Design a protein around this ligand. Structure first.
Ligand SMILES: *[C@@H]1O[C@H](CO)[C@@H](O[C@@H]2O[C@H](CO)[C@@H](O)[C@H](O)[C@H]2NC(C)=O)[C@H](O)[C@H]1NC(C)=O
Lengths: 48, 49
């Protein structure tokens, strides 16, 4: 969040690894920005 | 806005914040109705000295 604008950047890349976070390089593109104006102190994810 | 927002006894439906601990941030909006501590004492419940 910057001054109330909450922003997302992301990247999905294919891989083939069965160990820690793949050592290598890429950049996230900007994806969305929503003008929510809220405070965010903290967060949680959502499983299914 | 005289004509639209004024009432002869008083249009007291309009509020402003008058007492708080610090000044707010750019484009912050604060919806609190919690009691301000104007003395050194902590304040608890509805009202107090
Ligand atoms: C967003 O919320 C947090 C937490 O409620 C605020 O930080 C608190 O501020 C008070 C007063 O300074 C402190 O006593 C708390 O210990 C703080 N806690 C945390 C986790 O920060 C923060 O100021 C709020 N931000 C805005 C912009 O209102």
């Amino acid at each position: 969040n910057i001054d109330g604008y909450f922003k997302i950047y992301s990247k999905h890349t294919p891989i083939n690894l069965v160990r820690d976070l793949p050592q290598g390089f890429s950049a996230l593109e900007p994806l969305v920005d929503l003008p929510i104006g809220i405070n965010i102190t903290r967060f949680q994810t959502l499983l299914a | 806005s005289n004509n639209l927002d004024s009432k002869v006894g008083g249009n007291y439906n309009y509020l402003y914040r008058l007492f708080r601990k610090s000044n707010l941030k750019p484009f912050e909006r604060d919806i609190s109705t919690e009691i301000y501590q104007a003395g050194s004492t902590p304040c608890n419940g509805v009202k107090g000295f």
